[PDB]
Amino acid sequence: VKNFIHKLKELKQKSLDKFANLLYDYGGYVYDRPCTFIICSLICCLLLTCGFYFKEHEKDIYKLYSISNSYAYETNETINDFFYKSRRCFILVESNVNLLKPKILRELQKFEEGTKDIEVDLSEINECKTNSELPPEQSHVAKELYKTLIQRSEENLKSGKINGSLFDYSDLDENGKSVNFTDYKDDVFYPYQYIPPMLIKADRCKLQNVFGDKNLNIDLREASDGLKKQITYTLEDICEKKYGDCNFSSLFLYYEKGNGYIDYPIKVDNLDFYVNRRTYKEMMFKGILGNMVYEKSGSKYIIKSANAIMTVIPLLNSHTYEPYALAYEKKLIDYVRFYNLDDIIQDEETNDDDPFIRFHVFTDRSLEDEVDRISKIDNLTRLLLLIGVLLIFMYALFNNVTSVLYRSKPLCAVMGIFCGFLGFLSGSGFLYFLGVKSVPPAETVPFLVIGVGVDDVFVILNSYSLLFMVKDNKKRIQMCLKDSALAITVTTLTNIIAFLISAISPFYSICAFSLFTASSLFFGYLMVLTFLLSFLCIEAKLEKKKRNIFTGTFHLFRENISIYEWIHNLYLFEESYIYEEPKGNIGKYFRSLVKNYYVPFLSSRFGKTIVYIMFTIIIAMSIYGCTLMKKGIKYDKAFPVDSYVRRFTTAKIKYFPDFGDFIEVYYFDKHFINKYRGLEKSPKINKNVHWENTNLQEELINMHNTLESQEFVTSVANGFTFFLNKNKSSLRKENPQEFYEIFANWLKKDFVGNLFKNDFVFLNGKLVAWRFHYFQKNVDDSEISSKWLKACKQITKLENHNVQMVCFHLSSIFNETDESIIEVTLINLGITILTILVVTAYIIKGFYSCVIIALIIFLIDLCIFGFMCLCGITMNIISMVILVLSVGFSIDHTSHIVQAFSHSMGRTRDEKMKESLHLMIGPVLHSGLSTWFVISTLFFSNKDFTVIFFQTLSLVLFFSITFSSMFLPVLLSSFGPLH
Ligand SMILES: CC(C)CCC[C@@H](C)[C@H]1CC[C@H]2[C@@H]3CC=C4C[C@@H](O)CC[C@]4(C)[C@H]3CC[C@]12C
Numbered sequence: 001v002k003n004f005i006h007k008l009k010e011l012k013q014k015s016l017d018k019f020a021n022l023l024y025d026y027g028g029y030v031y032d033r034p035c036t037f038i039i040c041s042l043i044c045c046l047l048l049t050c051g052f053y054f055k056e057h058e059k060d061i062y063k064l065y066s067i068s069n070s071y072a073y074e075t076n077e078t079i080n081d082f083f084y085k086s087r088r089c090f091i092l093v094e095s096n097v098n099l100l101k102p103k104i105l106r107e108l109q110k111f112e113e114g115t116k117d118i119e120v121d122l123s124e125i126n127e128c129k130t131n132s133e134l135p136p137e138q139s140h141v142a143k144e145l146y147k148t149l150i151q152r153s154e155e156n157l158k159s160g161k162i163n164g165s166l167f168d169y170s171d172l173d174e175n176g177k178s179v180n181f182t183d184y185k186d187d188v189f190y191p192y193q194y195i196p197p198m199l200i201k202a203d204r205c206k207l208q209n210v211f212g213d214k215n216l217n218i219d220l221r222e223a224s225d226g227l228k229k230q231i232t233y234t235l236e237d238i239c240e241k242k243y244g245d246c247n248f249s250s251l252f253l254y255y256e257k258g259n260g261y262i263d264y265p266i267k268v269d270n271l272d273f274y275v276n277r278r279t280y281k282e283m284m285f286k287g288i289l290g291n292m293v294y295e296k297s298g299s300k301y302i303i304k305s306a307n308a309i310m311t312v313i314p315l316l317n318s319h320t321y322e323p324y325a326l327a328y329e330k331k332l333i334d335y336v337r338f339y340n341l342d343d344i345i346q347d348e349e350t351n352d353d354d355p356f357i358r359f360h361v362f363t364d365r366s367l368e369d370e371v372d373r374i375s376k377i378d379n380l381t382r383l384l385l386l387i388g389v390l391l392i393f394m395y396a397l398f399n400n401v402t403s404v405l406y407r408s409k410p411l412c413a414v415m416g417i418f419c420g421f422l423g424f425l426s427g428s429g430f431l432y433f434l435g436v437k438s439v440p441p442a443e444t445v446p447f448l449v450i451g452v453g454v455d456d457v458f459v460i461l462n463s464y465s466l467l468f469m470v471k472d473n474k475k476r477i478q479m480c481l482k483d484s485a486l487a488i489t490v491t492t493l494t495n496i497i498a499f500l501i502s503a504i505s506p507f508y509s510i511c512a513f514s515l516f517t518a519s520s521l522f523f524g525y526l527m528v529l530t531f532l533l534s535f536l537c538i539e540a541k542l543e544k545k546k547r548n549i550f551t552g553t554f555h556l557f558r559e560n561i562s563i564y565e566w567i568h569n570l571y572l573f574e575e576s577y578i579y580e581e582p583k584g585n586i587g588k589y590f591r592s593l594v595k596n597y598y599v600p601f602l603s604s605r606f607g608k609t610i611v612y613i614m615f616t617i618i619i620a621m622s623i624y625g626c627t628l629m630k631k632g633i634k635y636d637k638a639f640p641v642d643s644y645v646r647r648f649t650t651a652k653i654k655y656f657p658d659f660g661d662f663i664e665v666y667y668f669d670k671h672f673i674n675k676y677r678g679l680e681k682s683p684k685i686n687k688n689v690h691w692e693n694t695n696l697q698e699e700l701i702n703m704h705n706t707l708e709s710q711e712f713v714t715s716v717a718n719g720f721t722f723f724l725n726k727n728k729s730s731l732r733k734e735n736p737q738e739f740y741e742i743f744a745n746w747l748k749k750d751f752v753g754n755l756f757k758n759d760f761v762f763l764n765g766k767l768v769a770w771r772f773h774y775f776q777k778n779v780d781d782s783e784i785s786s787k788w789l790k791a792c793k794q795i796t797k798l799e800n801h802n803v804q805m806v807c808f809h810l811s812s813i814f815n816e817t818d819e820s821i822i823e824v825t826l827i828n829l830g831i832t833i834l835t836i837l838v839v840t841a842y843i844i845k846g847f848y849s850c851v852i853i854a855l856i857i858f859l860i861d862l863c864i865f866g867f868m869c870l871c872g873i874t875m876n877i878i879s880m881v882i883l884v885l886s887v888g889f890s891i892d893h894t895s896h897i898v899q900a901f902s903h904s905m906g907r908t909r910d911e912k913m914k915e916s917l918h919l920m921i922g923p924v925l926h927s928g929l930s931t932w933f934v935i936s937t938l939f940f941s942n943k944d945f946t947v948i949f950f951q952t953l954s955l956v957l958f959f960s961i962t963f964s965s966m967f968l969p970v971l972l973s974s975f976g977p978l979h
C-alpha cells in the first residue's frame with residue numbers, strides 16, 4: 001500500500017501539472033480572441049440576471065431564525081388545535097404627566113373611543129381577494145363530526161341541563177376506550193359553547209361565515225373588488241364580547257354606566273377584583289395602569305397620578321378571523337403610532353422636567369413587522385455598500401497604476417471590480433431560478449462577494465508582473481495562468497465547500513445565505529476566468545505595443561522557468577537585468593519594500609522571538625476571552641431604537657415591574673388528543689388521570705402554592721384551585737361523575753367559573769384538556785427567563801399522580817434556539833474542519849504542511865472567538881455563520897501562503913520562507929485590504945445584523961492577515977516542512 005500511496009501522491013502532482021497545462025491552453029485560447037469571450041460572458045451573465053424577475057422573498061421570522069424543533073412547534077399546534085386563544089393588542093399610553101387630570105382623561109377617552117371607531121374594508125385583506133384560493137377542505141367525516149357537535153351544542157345550550165349519569169367513567173384502556181364516525185360520535189363537550197378548534201375549519205372567504213351580522217351572505221373571494229371595498233367591518237365585528245358587550249380591558253370600564261366620572265377622582269376597593277356593579281364587570285387596576293404614584297386610603301384607593309396607562313384589546317384568534325384580525329391590527333398600530341395628543345399635554349406638570357405621550361403599541365404580528373424593519377435593506381446600508389465598492393475600486397486603481405503608464409493596468413482593476421458584482425448577479429439569478437427565496441442577511445451577500453472576487457484579481461495580476469521577463473506577451477499570459485490558476489481554483493473551491501457546510505445548518509436564513517453566497521462566488525470565479533482574463537489579455541496586448549490606456553483610447557478614437565525558480569535564482573544571485581524588474585511593474589515597488597525590511601525582520605531570530613511573544617500573548621488574551629464567553633443568549637433579537645415594539649417593551653418593564661410574560665400551562669389527555677389528531681389526518685405519563693382523587697387535588701393546590709412562592713412568578717390565575725377551594729367538602733367522594741357535575745355547575749353558575757369558562761373542556765365529563773395562566777416577572781436577560789421556564793416545567797410536573805403540565809410562551813422558541821445556537825455552530829465548525837482538512841490533504845504537496853494548516857486554522861478560530869467575546873459581541877447567529885465564512889476566507893489566505901512556501905525553493909528553510917514572502921505577500925495583503933475596504937462602511941448600521949457582522953468579519957480578517965503574514969511565515973521558517 002505504501003507503494004500505492006506514493007504512486008497516488010505522484011498521481012496528485014501529475015494531475016496538478018495537467019491542470020496547469022489545461023489552464024495554459026485555456027489562456028492561449030482566451031488570448032486568441034478576448035472580445036468574443038467578453039461578449040459571451042456578458043450575455044450569459046445577463047441571462048442569469050434575468051432570473052431576478054422570478055425572485056421571491058421569505059420573511060417569516062421563525063423560518064429564518066429558529067431550530068424549528070418538533071417539540072415547541074408541536075406544542076403550539078396542539079394548543080391552537082384544542083384550545084381557543086385571544087390575540088391581545090396592548091396600547092401603553094406612557095407619559096411624564098399625571099394622566100389623571102380631567103382634561104387629559106377626557107382626551108384619553110377620546111382616544112379610547114377612536115380605537116373602537118377604527119374600521120377596515122373587506123378588500124384590504126389579502127385572503128379576501130378573488131385571486132386568493134381556498135385551502136383543501138376538512139375531512140368529510142370530520143365535517144360530519146363538526147355538524148353533530150354544533151347540533152348537540154345548540155341542543156344542550158337550549159336545554160341548559162348538566163348531568164353525568166349518561167356518560168361512562170370507566171378508566172380508559174391503552175386504546176382510549178372502555179376511522180369510523182361512530183368512534184368520534186356522541187362526544188358530548190362541556191362547556192356546551194365549545195367545539196375543538198382543529199375541527200373549526202370552513203371557508204373564511206364567505207362574509208357570512210366570518211360576519212353573520214351583515215346578513216348579506218356574500219363571498220369575498222367570489223365578488224367584485226369594488227364591492228369588497230364597500231363592505232367594511234369595525235372593531236366590534238372582530239372583537240370578543242364578554243357579557244355580550246365587549247371583552248376589552250381598560251380604565252374606562254370604571255366609567256361605564258355612569259359609575260365613574262372623568263372629572264371626579266377614583267376610589268375602588270380592590271386592585272385586581274374591583275367590579276363595576278353597574279356593569280357587573282371587574283378590572284385589574286394594577287394591570288391597567290403602571291408606575292402609579294397613586295394613593296391608597298385603606299380599602300379605597302386614591303388614584304391621583306398614574307403616569308403610565310395601558311389598555312388591552314382582545315381579538316378572536318380563530319383561523320377564520322385571522323386575516324381580519326391582522327388587518328385591523330395593522331390599522332390599529334397606525335391609528336396609534338401616528339396618533340398624537342401633544343396639545344392637551346402642553347403646559348402641564350412634568351416629573352422629568354417636557355410632557356411626552358408616546359402611545360406605545362404592540363400586537364402579535366408587530367414582531368414580524370420589526371423583522372421586516374430589519375428584513376428590508378436600509379437605503380443608508382445600500383449607500384454604504386456603494387461607498388465601500390468605490391473605496392475598493394480606488395484602492396485597486398491605485399495599486400494598478402504605476403510610474404510607467406502603458407505598463408500599468410487600471411483596466412484590469414476596473415473590470416475586476418465590475419466582475420465581482422457581475423458574479424454576484426449571476427449567482428443571485430441562479431439561486432432565484434432554483435426557487436430558494438431571499439433572506440435579510442443576504443444584504444451582505446453582494447459586498448462581501450465583490451471583495452472575494454477582487455482578491456483573485458490581485459493574484460493573477462501579481463503573476464503577470466512576476467513574468468516581466470517574458471518577451472512574448474501571449475506566452476507571458478499563458479504562464480501567468482499556468483501558475484496562479486491552481487491557487488485561485490483552490491481558494492474558490494475551499495470557499496464554496498465551507499459555505500456549503502455552513503448551508504447544512506438547519507436555520508433556513510443561514511442555509512439560504514450560504515447557498516446564495518457560494519453560488520455567487522462560483523459564478524464570480526467563472527466570470528474571472530473568462531471576463532477579467534480577457535480584459536487582462538487586451539491590456540497585455542496594449543502594453544506589448546507600449547500603449548498607455550489614455551494613448552490607447554486616443555488611438556482607437558482616431559524560457560519556461562518557473563516563477564518560484566526565478567525568485568530562488570534571484571536570491572542565489574544576491575548571495576553569489578534578468579532579475580531586475582522594469583520600472584513601473586505592478587508590484588515591483590511593494591515587493592522591494594517588503595524584501596528590504598519586513599523579510600529580514602521575519603528572517604531574524606530576534607524578530608522571530610518578538611513575533612512568537614506577541615502571538616503567545618494574543619493566544620492568552622484569546623483564552624481569557626473564551627473563558628469570558630460574553631453572553632450566551634441574546635436579549636431582544638437585536639431590536640433597534642426605531643422599533644415601537646422594543647420601545648413598548650421597555651415602557652412595560654419600566655412602568656409594570658409586577659407584570660412580565662403571560663406564561664400558559666396546559667394539560668392534554670393523551671387519548672382525546674391522539675383520537676382527534678387521528679381523525680384529522682412512558683405511555684402512562686398522561687394516558688388517563690383520575691382527577692377525582694383527593695390526593696391529586698392536594699398535589700395540584702400544592703403546585704399552585706409552590707408556583708406562587710417562586711420569586712419570579714408574579715401571580716397565577718389557576719381557576720382549578722379556586723374550584724377546589726370552593727367545593728372541597730363536596731369533593732370528599734371520589735366519584736368522577738359528581739366531580740364533573742360539580743365542576744360544570746361551578747363553571748356555569750359561579751361568576752368565577754364564568755371567568756374561567758374557556759379554560760376547561762370535558763369529553764364525556766372526563767376533563768380531557770385544561771389550562772391555567774400566570775404572570776411572570778419581567779426581565780431583560782433571556783437566560784434567567786429560560787431558567788425560570790425550566791423551573792416552572794419542573795414544578796408543574798407532578799409525575800407522582802401520572803400528571804405532566806406543559807408550559808408555553810412566545811419567547812420559549814427563542815430561548816430554545818439560543819440554547820443550542822452554540823452547539824449547532826460547534827458541530828458545523830467540526831464538519832467544516834473535516835472538509836477543509838480533506839481538501840488541504842488533496843491540494844497540498846506535503847502532509848506536514850496539511851497538519852500545520854489545520855493547527856493554524858484552529859488557532860485562528862480560537863483567537864477570533866476569544867477576541868469577539870472580549871469586544872462585547874454575544875452569541876448571535878450572524879456571528880456563528882460569519883465565523884465559518886471568515887474561516888473559509890482565512891484558510892484561502894493560509895492555502896495561498898502554504899502553497900507559496902511549499903513550492904518555493906531554497907537551501908535554507910528561512911530562505912524558502914523569504915522567497916515565499918517575496919512572491920506572495922503582496923496578493924494576500926491586497927486581498928485582505930480590499931475585503932476590509934468593502935466591509936468598512938458597515939461600521940455603523942441601522943440594525944445589529946450588519947454592524948455586528950462588520951465587527952466579526954473585520955476582526956477575523958485582521959487575524960487572518962496577521963497569522964498568514966507573521967505567525968505562519970515564522971512558523972514555516974523555523975519549523976516548516978523543509979524538503
Ligand atoms: C380570589 C379572586 C376572586 C381574585 C381575583 C382574581 C384575578 C386576579 C384573576 C381572576 C380571573 C383572571 C383573568 C382570567 C382570564 C384572563 C384572560 C387573559 O387573556 C388575560 C388575563 C385575564 C383577564 C385574567 C386576569 C386576572 C384575573 C382577573
Ligand SMILES: *[C@@H]1O[C@H](CO)[C@@H](O)[C@H](O)[C@H]1NC(C)=O
Nearest residue numbers: 161162163164165166737741
Ligand atoms: C340526568 O341524569 C340524572 C341522573 O344524574 C337522571 O335523572 C337523568 O338521566 C337526567 N335528568 C333529567 C333528564 O332530568
